[PDB]
Symmetry: D2
Subunit: 349 residues, 4 copies
């Protein structure tokens, strides 16, 4: 196939290593440049990274030289992918886009910018149309696309196909997030093992707001935010990978429990239709067993691109369900790569 | 300092060992007999228990011989306390009550029986008055008093002083329950470490139903169930001790956070007033830091009898707060003993 | 040339491991699976609490559970056993007394003089004992044994160093994963954030079994290796992977680099004949001072290779840390490798 | 009680919070000043520390203002206690000592200095005599005493009473150390949970060498190192508090197994003889059960000041025993305080 040359910002972290691994064997996406901190620039990827993924560093990437995050080092790249930390992404990504680079990033800055698409492939690929007016609106020579917070990404999967119910209700959400969500070394053993921390800075606000844009509707070259009144409580649990979410759609709207299970299990979108390399066959898996989903059993579903839903139940004035997803793949690495695949498929390239 | 002689059924399990450790040093409750499995009867406590509590076995209980769960072995005790497993409690307990014994137990059978008080001291001590007509209603010679499910007991604490708002709203509760909740060896290491099991057999139904009785109002010898419409999701987490609850009261009622915090921090009842030995000075502790409560920090609050609440917040049509309590003490051992103390105080002796 | 086999104790962790491995084997065809009495007659998928990775191989999910009695294993070429130590003796003896070829990783008969205790790369030659077993035991069938999972792991590095390990005292400390006691053997409360410096009978099995594993086959029988070792076994909050600290007391000069070289270049029959379950390099050596580590190395070569690191020699003591997959190298894998070796040498 | 005013360097780390906790309630040791990093100086302890100990900050220390580590801020203390990290200790301590202060540190610098006593109270309080000549030998106006590596402190407990045998043999030791040994946030959850790291930078060398000095003999005002041929391997395990150790004494010497057990459990020294406040009545506890010692069961033995020994066995050419101690108390906080107690008792003040 005709290869599309890509570079990767923040390739040293957990999300970065996941992407490096997924790209090392990609059909047409050819990773030719990886970036990391300044002091590592010039060294080979294998000499700068502390491999945390499964197995050895791919040979196709181990010798890739570390380049800076500056425009000059990415001139020959077709698309720049970014996994930079939230506190460094704004300046870096802004300068690149100003210089004409096409940037697809999963870092938080700009995610809620009205002219920037926040993409989760299956959920709102149509929102990419915003790209048609971005250059003129921001006065950029480049292109910027964003991916949502990992938890938001996971939570949006079951909500979208049920957007009509969720829109007319009070959404209560409790999220149980794995330690890896804070990076590989973000949380100490002493602080979390055999424990629970009912607080994750800024996570609750990002979830509620981003969910509003992910489920929004495109009208007249703009995104009309979906009306979602959600209250969320994000908790950190002693889990390595996998974000769980207990969703309670408090509403008196009629609800056909079986039709809902059917709708979720049959949910397919453009990524599934065009059979994109990183698109899972069934983005949403429904489990009938009452003790599912569970991180150690379902986290890897379809390479971590599929979310698993269980305990779907309808009680008085409320539809409840439990969803699980790989925060590293579905929540970051995989959706960024899947976003690029979609863009190529739609001609934004 | 007159000693009231008591016996303990199911003294070998975690709840049992806790009560043994608590009774060993009680000011007036004298543990004189303990029961365990049949093959253990006749052996001294120390030779039949796999002690998992802190430090050595109390020297005032170690040599206590194990007796049977039959009437003849308890004719000489003032009160029969029981921490028997749910599946064996009904038949055993009923006979002791049918033969005239006063039985106070934390096992599930009879909890929702209209003529049996389901007590959590600070919450509904007044319900003990149901006993005035129990004998004639049941045709028993004895008296039976019950303590609720450990989780319900913990959840009911903050809900009581906020019963006015809880009655006029949809209550959504998600609970994170420690492994100890399933006994010392109920859950294997492989099944839970680094994992989450979004289900606990029968737990959710119990929580919802019992909260109704615990917050009910004793009116003319009958308990009027509190109108508490709640949907609960119980989850097992890799925690040793301490059940956490995320409570969302979705209503249109006015929500004053500073007022609610005052109400919760100043909550007190008969146990506190009378300074009963197992009563915490402050039954509800409120935390202002955003990362509280946490099991490893707060589960021991006031010897495990006080619950800890934090993250009290007000969002559109919803009051949210996080509560944590020691499931072995506040949730079982401590409330059974405290119940006996109240009974002594009110004259039921 | 297909070889039809059955599996006793196919429902436990080792059993499920073997099921996954056999489901896709070149010539070994799993035709029957056995489990406890109450499970007999049920389809495997309905009797087992699948705990392995992926789904249950479709060639096994619908296999109906059969008993452990001879009559149900008549049409089988070789009977593989992953039975628990407490039930194996009676069950296996009867099968063998009926003319069945039985290869098991259970402990009973491991130290029986006429029964080979095999760990492929270490002592495949010991399989010769089989040429005399029938008359020596008065059996119609055949019986082969695989060692204790920890012994199996500790033996890998000791073999190529047998000359020095022989003339010296050996001190061994082992840290064994929770799975070594099955999936539900140890509770969360008992081990999380903890260490239990004791595993019933483990230390005696390792010392004695290492003796036979490293023995010399002389004049139709095994000469136990003179391995004077004191071992202390400890249980740790790990899922899979048994670790070992091995100290051999030398009274000479040792070249660490040649030790590393000797270990990584270790090869044997299983490698020579490229058998399906034999790892290309049974012993992997790590130069980084913080290896091996269970989460990083436990899966080395599908779990058939052990990893050694921290190879040091000072104060007349050769010290090394080794790690092995207690479920594959420790059992499932070597039991299958053993059968492969048997087919390779003509015992079939 | 005759008061002794002290200050504590590194009051903020785990070991420091432990000491703060132990000194608040001390009979005659008055913690009058606490120190920490420069950016914390001038703030109240409660506002500068990330409290991680059980319960609340002692109110006798919560309002103490953080001072510097320089001499000017300690001119008024009788003794300066130090729990500073190994990498900063040397310069800071040397300067205090050079200015005439008496410093007792559990940090590694100067531990193996021949003119400086390395103390573990029971094992070698006698070595304190080195102080009578320390000024003449170092030129210092002050006084410096050191405490050993925590693992070495624990390991030296059982080796001392058995020094005659240990000296005529080859000692093989494998230590399994708790995560807290590397500080509260030294190791990440991802790196250690469900894992084992067979390496701890420089631990093995420290144990072997320090073991040599701890067990030495005082002769002609100096220390004759004990001839201890040790070969230690140190491993990191996923436990919170408590270092375990497998000690193998390879010797052909005749050994009476019951005499060893008798010798260990009966070990007592000056700290015990003088009934010092932080001295445990029984420095070494021996267990008969085959599955002991265990971190979660024994680490707290006598407020963490007593080590627990178990599995004592003599197979043939090897004396094997397993030992466990609290790395934070016996291994650091408790011995530093105990050391000061010994000094006061012997007239060093």
């Amino acid at each position: 196939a005709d290869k599309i040359k890509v570079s990767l910002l923040g390739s040293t972290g957990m999300v970065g290593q996941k992407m490096v691994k997924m790209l090392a064997k990609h059909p047409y996406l050819e990773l030719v440049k990886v970036s990391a901190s300044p002091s590592k620039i010039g060294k080979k990827y294998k000499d700068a990274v502390k491999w945390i993924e499964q197995g050895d560093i791919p040979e196709e990437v181990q010798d890739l030289p570390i380049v800076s995050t500056n425009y000059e080092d990415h001139k020959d790249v077709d698309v720049v992918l970014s996994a930079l930390p939230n506190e460094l992404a704004e300046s870096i990504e802004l300068e690149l886009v100003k210089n004409g680079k096409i940037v697809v990033s999963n870092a938080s800055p700009f995610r809620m910018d009205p002219d920037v698409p926040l993409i989760n492939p299956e959920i709102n690929w149509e929102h990419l149309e915003l790209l048609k007016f971005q250059k003129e609106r921001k006065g950029w020579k480049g292109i910027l696309v964003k991916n949502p917070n990992c938890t938001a990404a996971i939570m949006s999967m079951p909500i979208k196909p049920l957007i009509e119910i969720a829109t007319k209700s009070k959404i209560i959400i409790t999220t149980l997030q794995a330690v890896s969500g804070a990076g590989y070394n973000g949380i100490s053993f002493m602080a979390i093992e055999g424990n629970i921390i009912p607080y994750i800075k800024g996570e609750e606000d990002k979830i509620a707001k981003e969910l509003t844009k992910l489920n929004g509707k495109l009208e007249n070259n703009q995104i009309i935010p979906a009306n979602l009144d959600s209250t969320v409580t994000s908790i950190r649990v002693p889990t390595r990978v996998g974000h769980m979410g207990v969703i309670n759609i408090v509403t008196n709207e009629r609800i056909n429990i079986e039709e809902i299970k059917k709708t979720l299990k049959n949910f397919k979108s453009l990524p599934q239709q065009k059979n994109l390399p990183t698109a899972p066959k069934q983005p949403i898996i429904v489990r009938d067993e009452e003790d599912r989903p569970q991180p150690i059993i379902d986290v890897n579903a379809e390479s971590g691109m599929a979310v698993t839903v269980g305990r779907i139940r309808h009680e008085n004035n409320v539809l409840r369900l439990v969803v699980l997803g790989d925060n590293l793949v579905r929540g970051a690495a995989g959706i960024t790569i899947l976003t690029v695949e979609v863009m190529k498929e739609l001609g934004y390239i």
